[PDB]
Amino acid sequence: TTCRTADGDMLDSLCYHVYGHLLGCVEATLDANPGLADEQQPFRAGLLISFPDMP
Amino acid sequence: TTCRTADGDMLDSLCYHVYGHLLGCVEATLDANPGLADEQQPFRAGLLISFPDMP
Amino acid sequence: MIGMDRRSGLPLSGLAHLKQSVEDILTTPLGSRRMRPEYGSKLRRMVDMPVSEGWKSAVQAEVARSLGRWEPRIGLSAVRVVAVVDGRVDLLLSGVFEG
Amino acid sequence: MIGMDRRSGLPLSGLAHLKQSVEDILTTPLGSRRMRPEYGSKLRRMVDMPVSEGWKSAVQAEVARSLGRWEPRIGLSAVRVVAVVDGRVDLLLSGVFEG
Amino acid sequence: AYLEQLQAGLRYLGRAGESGRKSLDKVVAPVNGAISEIRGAAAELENLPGVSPEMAARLQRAMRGIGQAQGKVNRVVSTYDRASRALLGIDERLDALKVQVNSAAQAVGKVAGDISPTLAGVLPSWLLAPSATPPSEAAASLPHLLVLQPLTANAQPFYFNLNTAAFDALQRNSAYNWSGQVRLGRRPALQSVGMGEESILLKGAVFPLRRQVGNQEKVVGLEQLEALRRLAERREPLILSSGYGEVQMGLWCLVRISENQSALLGNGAPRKQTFDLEFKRYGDD
Amino acid sequence: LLVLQPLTANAQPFYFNLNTAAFDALQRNSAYNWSGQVRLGRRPALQSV
Amino acid sequence: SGYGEVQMGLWCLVRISENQSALLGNGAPRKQTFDLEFKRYGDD
Numbered sequence: 001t002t003c004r005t006a007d008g009d010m011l012d013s014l015c016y017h018v019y020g021h022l023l024g025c026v027e028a029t030l031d032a033n034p035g036l037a038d039e040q041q042p043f044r045a046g047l048l049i050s051f052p053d054m055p
Numbered sequence: 056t057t058c059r060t061a062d063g064d065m066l067d068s069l070c071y072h073v074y075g076h077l078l079g080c081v082e083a084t085l086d087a088n089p090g091l092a093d094e095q096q097p098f099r100a101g102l103l104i105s106f107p108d109m110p
Numbered sequence: 111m112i113g114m115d116r117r118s119g120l121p122l123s124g125l126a127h128l129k130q131s132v133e134d135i136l137t138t139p140l141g142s143r144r145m146r147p148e149y150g151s152k153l154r155r156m157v158d159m160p161v162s163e164g165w166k167s168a169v170q171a172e173v174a175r176s177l178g179r180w181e182p183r184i185g186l187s188a189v190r191v192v193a194v195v196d197g198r199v200d201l202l203l204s205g206v207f208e209g
Numbered sequence: 210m211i212g213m214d215r216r217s218g219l220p221l222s223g224l225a226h227l228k229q230s231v232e233d234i235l236t237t238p239l240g241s242r243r244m245r246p247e248y249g250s251k252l253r254r255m256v257d258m259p260v261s262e263g264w265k266s267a268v269q270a271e272v273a274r275s276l277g278r279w280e281p282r283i284g285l286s287a288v289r290v291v292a293v294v295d296g297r298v299d300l301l302l303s304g305v306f307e308g
Numbered sequence: 309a310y311l312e313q314l315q316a317g318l319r320y321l322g323r324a325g326e327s328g329r330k331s332l333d334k335v336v337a338p339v340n341g342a343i344s345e346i347r348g349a350a351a352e353l354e355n356l357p358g359v360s361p362e363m364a365a366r367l368q369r370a371m372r373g374i375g376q377a378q379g380k381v382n383r384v385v386s387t388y389d390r391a392s393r394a395l396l397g398i399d400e401r402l403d404a405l406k407v408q409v410n411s412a413a414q415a416v417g418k419v420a421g422d423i424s425p426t427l428a429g430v431l432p433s434w435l436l437a438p439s440a441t442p443p444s445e446a447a448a449s450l451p452h453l454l455v456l457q458p459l460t461a462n463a464q465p466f467y468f469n470l471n472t473a474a475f476d477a478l479q480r481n482s483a484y485n486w487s488g489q490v491r492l493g494r495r496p497a498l499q500s501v502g503m504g505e506e507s508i509l510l511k512g513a514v515f516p517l518r519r520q521v522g523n524q525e526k527v528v529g530l531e532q533l534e535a536l537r538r539l540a541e542r543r544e545p546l547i548l549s550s551g552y553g554e555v556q557m558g559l560w561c562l563v564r565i566s567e568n569q570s571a572l573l574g575n576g577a578p579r580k581q582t583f584d585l586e587f588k589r590y591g592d593d
Numbered sequence: 594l595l596v597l598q599p600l601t602a603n604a605q606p607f608y609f610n611l612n613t614a615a616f617d618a619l620q621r622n623s624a625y626n627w628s629g630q631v632r633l634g635r636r637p638a639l640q641s642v
Numbered sequence: 643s644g645y646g647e648v649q650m651g652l653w654c655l656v657r658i659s660e661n662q663s664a665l666l667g668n669g670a671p672r673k674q675t676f677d678l679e680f681k682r683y684g685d686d
Contacts, residue, residue, distance in 0.1 A: 001431075003432065004430055006432075012243060017437045017438070020460075026244070048427075075601075077145055077147065123429055140602060147603075148601065168596075170644050171606070174648040178649045179602070185647065185649060186648045188648070239462055246461075246462075247460065251440070258442075263445075263449055263451060264446070264447060266455075267447070267455075273547070276556070502632065503637065530645050537623065540625055543641035564624050566620065566621065566622045566623065567621050588627060588639060589636060589639075591632070591638050597655075600652075616678075
């Protein structure tokens with residue numbers, strides 16, 4: 001379930017739109033994403049997040 | 056329950072019309088029929104299938 | 111879901127696969143598939159019948175059955191006759207997307 | 210309950226904290242907070258919409274939702290348009306105090 | 309000699325996993341004829357410089373097939389008793405297929421690596437994102453009669469007005485749980501053991517051919533009571549928001565919808581829909 | 594007006610129109626299973642079961 | 643149906659009850675007031 005951001009899309013908003021809740025849903029996204037947390041949290045327009053299943 | 060085909064009648068259709076389902080119903084027809092599977096599956100007009108009971 | 115195209119063998123996934131998923135329902139008659147007799151549409155039985163106002167509501171009621179079986183990611187909205195030339199009626203298959 | 214002021218950092222407790230508790234609800238949009246997506250108001254969505262008599266009842270119905278979530282010590286009474294200048298509508302947020 | 313070796317190696321395992329249906333002894337000789345024979349290619353492929361863009365897709369065509377050959381053997385073998393398998397002694401033999409073929413698959417992957425898992429299902433950040441703008445109902449020229457709105461706080465609320473449903477009746481039952489305990493020589497004692505069910509019942513009628521107010525080139529829809537149904541299968545409480553007395557009504561879960569749609573059109577379309585909704589107060593903290 | 598059609602998919606469907614049955618009323622009850630659990634000092638909790 | 647959603651779900655039929663009256667000589671009615679009653683079959 002790979003999604004592409006815009007220049008203002010943010011991580012806790014995105015995995016709330018995908019999953020429906022945020023309990024155990026942000027760090028599971030940061031786990032299966034290489035170098036995602038190193039990038040600045042107001043995202044750039046072209047970075048890809050593969051949201052895993054069962055957060 | 057012996058049935059006679061036409062030149063386009065087919066095996067999985069016939070034993071679905073006879074039995075009502077196809078789970079375990081085609082190979083039980085091919086079991087009690089000598090030389091049926093050797094004949095081509097678009098059947099000829101005059102070959103006889105004896106459909107057994109309890110497929 | 112990622113499938114392959116019917117012609118040309120190319121793997122197409124998003125919504126071109128959605129349209130060919132519908133046209134495998136509408137143009138296969140019932141019992142033509144192998145070991146899957148309850149697959150397809152009765153639209154081939156509706157071929158070359160007179161276009162009345164009960165023929166229209168029998169096509170809407172049969173596309174909705176056949177897409178309701180093997181296409182759960184499509185909610186059917188309406189089927190409308192939009193033109194008539196000699197024999198060739200043409201139907202705007204409109205439906206919302208789910209799933 | 211004793212909190213601190215938003216500007217100037219001073220700890221104010223009784224009823225000045227009550228008013229800034231409401232204005233953190235009304236001016237935050239939804240999803241702007243971190244790890245709290247169901248916080249704030251849809252009043253920023255009501256910004257720059259025409260002031261009809263259904264816009265008024267949709268603001269009363271949305272202030273009452275957003276204060277009903279994160280402000281239990283305020284019972285909302287009414288929201289009334291009291292003046293109109295060019296663009297600037299102004300709303301008398303009146304409500305009784307509970308808790 | 310891998311052009312002779314692995315293609316002959318899959319030929320033994322075709323006999324291994326299929327001549328083992330109702331017997332055991334016919335499995336061991338092709339399995340012995342493979343483990344010491346796939347090793348003839350796992351030692352051969354130790355040193356290749358990547359000989360061709362072809363000639364190693366053939367290795368990928370073969371090692372996918374030998375990977376299918378492990379699945380055929382290890383499922384046909386697993387249908388047997390363990391004691392009948394222990395007397396044969398191929399529990400300690402089929403693991404050598406997990407040694408030699410994996411050493412052969414590592415040898416193919418060093419010579420010719422795999423293709424990258426390309427991505428075609430990359431979506432933007434929209435298809436799972438709600439349209440947070442309010443609908444045309446909230447901007448209409450009609451004061452809203454009652455407002456349904458759920459706990460997710462981003463879902464679209466339902467607005468009761470003359471365009472959508474427009475109830476004119478409002479039952480509001482509200483019991484209070486006083487339990488009676490019969491005493492023998494006197495009046496029965498009453499104890500407040502709770503609050504009991506408070507319910508709100510909304511009557512009314514939807515006429516889905518009356519045009520929207522001011523003749524907006526748009527009628528009251530047939531969809532406009534099914535929106536009450538979709539908002540009720542969320543398994544979720546709802547905030548009632550009136551506009552007359554208290555505005556902050558509590559959490560009210562929706563329990564029953566029952567329309568009576570009659571005076572039908574040709575395609576089954578009604579032109580009256582007399583409904584009755586029925587809520588119960590969700591007892592939050 | 595309405596069409597009945599079964600799961601066997603080859604059986605003959607039933608067509609509601611003025612020739613066959615032609616209903617003019619349509620009750621559609623639809624409950625939602627919210628179960629009440631009485632708590633002693635407060636309102637009864639409702640759960641979507 | 644043909645008006646709103648067309649794909650209604652699976653609906654099993656539960657009750658048929660006709661009231662056939664104004665009879666002919668051989669028992670043939672000329673009115674049959676029925677009421678069908680469905681319940682939604684809960685498929686996956």
